[PDB]
Design a protein around this ligand. Structure first.
Ligand SMILES: *[C@@H]1O[C@H](CO)[C@@H](O[C@@H]2O[C@H](CO)[C@@H](O)[C@H](O)[C@H]2NC(C)=O)[C@H](O)[C@H]1NC(C)=O
Ligand code: NAG
Lengths: 36, 36
């Protein structure tokens, strides 16, 4: 992949996004619209 | 590529160097000795 150009890595890895989604989903299960 | 991280000119004059897309076995005051 080394030809004169590079690919930068993403700032947030997959576990980060998974944990955000789990937090949002647990919040909407328990609280509802209040936590917004 | 090489990037520099600095906390600001007004506060200090110390920077941290980040070498992108390289494995630390051929990198060579910033050569060795310091924290890698
Ligand atoms: C950077 O290079 C070193 C040395 O080539 C890599 O160390 C190897 O690590 C693997 C996995 O533990 C071992 O099977 C090899 O035997 C190691 N090499 C030697 C020469 O002992 C290291 O993994 C490299 N780093 C990256 C991020 O690729
Ligand atoms: C230097 O800049 C920083 C910006 O984060 C500021 O917080 C700090 O007060 C500044 N100090 C001086 C001496 O200007």
């Amino acid at each position: 992949k080394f030809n004169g150009l590079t690919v930068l890595p993403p700032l947030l890895t997959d576990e980060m996004i998974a944990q955000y989604t789990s937090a949002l989903l647990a919040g909407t299960i328990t609280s509802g619209w209040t936590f917004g | 590529g090489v990037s520099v991280i600095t906390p600001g000119t007004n506060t200090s004059n110390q920077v941290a160097v980040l070498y992108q897309g390289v494995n630390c076995t051929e990198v060579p005051v910033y050569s060795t000795g310091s924290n890698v």
